[PDB]
């Protein structure tokens, strides 16, 4: 696998040992060959599982995930997908890694797509080797891959709302259930229904993931209610997955606004990763997968692939050259390589709006490309009336940095800034100049 100009897709089935058995063998070989190596974890929870698997190999942990003292002699770096892309965008030297290993390489967050595009471009140029580890590479059509033990697959109607009757099979279960919901808000309503029926529920989403995931280890629980983030290598001691098979799709309408479309069907990759949370113990057959809909290729036209192009257009590769998307996912967006390339100062603004501002890529780009500076929040208030953000069915209001109460009415509307209570709270703090 470790020959230059090679990209290997390590597509062993979920629970086959990619992370705990194969990755340490690769790293040991890399260190033997003196290859400067990066290991890309999708989340800090995976970064911590990798540290355990790699314990006593010389690896530099470039993450808060882990508390380890580095010797300064490591040639193997480990960091999150998002950190890799972040450091590429910033005026910080990223070494030209000879070997690029991406774990959970199916991850469809914009920074992950961009990282794959950058790495695969370097391999295509003959500059580096790469290994993408995932049971579900781009365009997979198999929602039911092999498992360590047999799975009971049942097509069943799955609740997406509180229920009073008709789903006795959900609560009649005496084991532990991981339930994939299409949104935080939908998870909140299901979680409250289960709690009222006496169940112990933990809720996971992107913003709460590291903190809340520890509860699945530290305390007893009956249900985990999670968004699609638990597709990226999150392990549970569970015997059932309930899968809505639905997700929200960010969609850019008329180049002008982002809406959250759906819920609509997940991809086959997503369905296989949701299912792949169970059947992992060869000694525990008959884990159950209950699925509530079909799969479809809903990544086509999904805003994440356009956002990935915005990131890659702003990463230096060589002279004016621009990294392409990884070939199998390059048709998911109709974008012109370089159309989003920003001048030095606008690019700095773009980066800060993402890193400090915590704005979605698409929205960061609109602001930066309009020549607005990072701390100038007038655009949060000067949009058309149709861009008014609602809070409990009244216009949301914030005090501006000037001390004026104003209606939140952003010049560009991205539904992700107000998709749930936590998101809207964060965007109000931004509009107020609080970060
Ligand atoms: C106070 O102003 C309001 C309250 C409720 C509303 N429902 C629809 C609109 C108009 N839209 C631009 C928010 C509206 C305005």
From Swiss-Prot:
- Give residue numbers for the modification (N6-acetyllysine): 207
Q: Give positions of region: Important for RNA-binding.
A: 3-6
Top-level taxon of origin: Viruses
Entry's localization field: Host cytoplasm; Host endoplasmic reticulum membrane
Where does this chain carry the motif DEAH box? Answer: 103-106
What range(s) does the Helicase C-terminal domain occupy?
A: 150-329
The membrane-topology field of this record reads: Peripheral membrane protein
Instruction: Write down what this protein is called.
Output: Serine protease NS3
Give the originating organism: Zika virus
Classification from the root reads: Viruses, Riboviria, Orthornavirae, Kitrinoviricota, Flasuviricetes
First and last residues shown, out of full length: 1681 to 2115 of 3419
